[PDB]
Design a protein around this ligand. Structure first.
Ligand SMILES: Cc1ccc(-n2nccn2)c(C(=O)N2CCN(c3nc4cc(Cl)ccc4o3)CC[C@H]2C)c1
Ligand SMILES: CCCCCCCC/C=C\CCCCCCCC(=O)O
Ligand SMILES: CCCCCCCC/C=C\CCCCCCCC(=O)O
Length: 503
């Protein structure tokens, strides 16, 4: 009958001294200061400098401000509650602080989502990529609006109660803050939807987005620009060409060069050979030199050697060469032909371009991205005829200086390589941030979903370790706020620079 009543009456002053408290305090103040100075350093770094004012960094600022909010208001309250098992604040703050916590979690997740979306467009759909500062500073406002709108039920249900309800004796030592619902459907529904909205759906979506992003960035680390440059070549280019041609027993002429596996339906050496057969006539053919380098199918090798013994301006190399010598080739020949069928990386285009070799390549895959206007010739893949015509145009261009074209090739290759490297680094950082986020909010979510929907931890002496789980989960949640600036400091060069300069 009056068991809970009487037991509460007897044990109401039984404080149980927790063995590990000073470590919790130390952890909380550590996280507190680190999150504060870290996130403020983020905000300062971005706001002050102009090169930092990027959409990604505007969002990162939004995230940092969210974390600042949480760290300032909710972290100390969470510390006090978790240590003293009591609510030491007003009835108003009992609604406000958990509300601000929910809202800020929302803001954080949505921010990461917009980061992921922005990067997903920039990388996976470059053509549709629209991302001005006006969009960001206006989308952030939408994030805060929705976040401040959909969290009002939690503010509503937050109540500050103490002694067991329906009890005449309102005597108490301490009060506590918790949720008060009517129908038991309401808390289950709201908390399941809270887990879904603030964790499940956006982290799923972002998992997809970063999956596609990393799939698009995979294997694209760029090339060694320190190796692939003309600096290690001696003399003038035309004299290197003259030396090269005379070394193969040929005379001066507009030199084209293929390098790749002799494949049927990949590197397209067959397209090249066919194109040479097309060029076997015409007046222009004698003005051309061809150097076909590679090794693959015996049929294609024979097909090449036949041309090497038919036309005096065609040399075939099935010999194994060194990178230094390949470099020397790229810095000697006039044009390099990449008749690929689906070339996803086009490292030959980059490596050759860095050495002034002008690319004549099939408009497929990576090549399309690398070779733009005023920096190469692009061909419908597969068609030997259009390739031959491209070679003819190359010849008609060779009756001019071509030097600025080559310098354009160099610049394009270098900027492209640097861009893909920067891209890689950025995506890596954002990935790590998302990951650390997920791991940080995982325990509190598994606990909340196990406490508010699928039963609870309310029965008997099944509470002592559960409190410890909850305190740890809370601390972790706040530790994320300290984590992000550190992540930025290890994985973003510009943030490193600004974090150093701030001292
Ligand atoms: C302390 C803390 C930290 C993070 C939390 N989180 N889990 C998921 C998202 N974020 C929670 C938590 O379990 N939340 C979020 C909001 N809630 C809440 N209660 C709080 C009490 C204090 Cl002292 C300070 C902040 C508080 O936020 C009550 C509802 C419930 C869903 C609690
Ligand atoms: C809400 C889910 C996000 C929708 C974004 C995908 C848009 C599809 C596209 O533009 O190709
Ligand atoms: C989320 C991050 C997980 C990684 C995502 C995709 C990585 C890119 C796909 C790998 C391509 C190479 C596969 C292969 O060689 O067959």
């Amino acid at each position: 009958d009056y068991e809970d009543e009487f037991l509460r009456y007897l044990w109401r002053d039984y404080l149980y001294p927790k063995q590990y408290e000073w470590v919790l305090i130390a952890a909380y103040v550590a996280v507190f200061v680190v999150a504060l100075v870290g996130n403020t350093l983020v905000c300062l770094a971005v706001w002050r400098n102009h090169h930092m004012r990027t959409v990604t960094n505007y969002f990162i600022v939004n995230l940092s401000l969210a974390d600042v909010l949480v760290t300032a208001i909710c972290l100390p309250a969470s510390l006090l509650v978790d240590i003293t098992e009591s609510w030491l604040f007003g009835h108003a703050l009992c609604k406000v602080i958990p509300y601000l916590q929910a809202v800020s979690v929302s803001v954080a997740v949505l921010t990461l989502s917009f980061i992921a979306l922005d990067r997903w467009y920039a990388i996976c759909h470059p053509l549709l990529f629209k991302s001005t500062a006006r969009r960001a500073r206006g989308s952030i406002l939408g994030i805060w609006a929705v976040s401040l709108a959909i969290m009002v039920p939690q503010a509503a249900v937050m109540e500050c109660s103490s002694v067991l309800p329906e009890l005449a004796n309102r005597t108490r030592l301490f009060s506590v803050c918790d949720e008060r619902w009517a129908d038991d459907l309401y808390p289950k529904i709201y908390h399941s939807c809270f887990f879904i909205v603030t964790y499940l759906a956006p982290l799923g979506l972002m998992a997809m987005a970063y999956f596609q992003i990393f799939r698009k960035l995979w294997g694209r680390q760029g090339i060694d620009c320190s190796f692939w440059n003309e600096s290690y070549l001696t003399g003038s280019r035309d004299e290197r060409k003259k030396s090269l041609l005379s070394k193969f027993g040929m005379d001066e002429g507009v030199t084209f060069m293929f390098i790749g596996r002799f494949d049927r339906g990949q590197k397209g050496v067959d397209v090249l050979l066919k194109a040479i057969e097309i060029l076997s006539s015409k007046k222009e053919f004698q003005e051309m030199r061809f150097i076909i380098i590679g090794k693959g199918d015996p049929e294609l090798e024979g097909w090449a050697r036949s041309l090497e013994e038919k036309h005096g301006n065609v040399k075939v190399i099935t010999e194994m060469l060194s990178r230094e010598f390949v470099r020397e080739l790229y810095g000697s020949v006039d044009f390099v032909i990449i008749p690929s069928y689906f070339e996803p990386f086009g490292l030959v285009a980059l490596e050759a371009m860095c050495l002034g070799a002008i690319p004549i390549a099939s408009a497929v895959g990576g090549l399309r991205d690398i070779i733009t206007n005023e920096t190469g010739i692009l061909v419908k893949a597969g068609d030997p005829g259009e390739l031959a015509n491209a070679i003819l145009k190359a010849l008609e261009l060779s009756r001019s200086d071509l030097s600025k074209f080559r310098e354009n090739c160099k610049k394009r290759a270098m900027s492209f390589s640097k861009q893909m490297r920067a891209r890689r680094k950025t995506a890596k950082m954002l990935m790590v941030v998302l990951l650390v986020f997920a791991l940080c909010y995982l325990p509190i979510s598994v606990l909340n979903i196990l406490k508010r929907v699928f039963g609870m931890f309310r029965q008997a002496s099944d509470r002592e370790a559960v409190y410890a789980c909850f305190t740890f989960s809370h601390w972790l949640v706040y530790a994320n706020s300290a984590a992000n600036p550190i992540i930025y400091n290890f994985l973003s060069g510009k943030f490193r620079e600004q974090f150093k300069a701030a001292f």
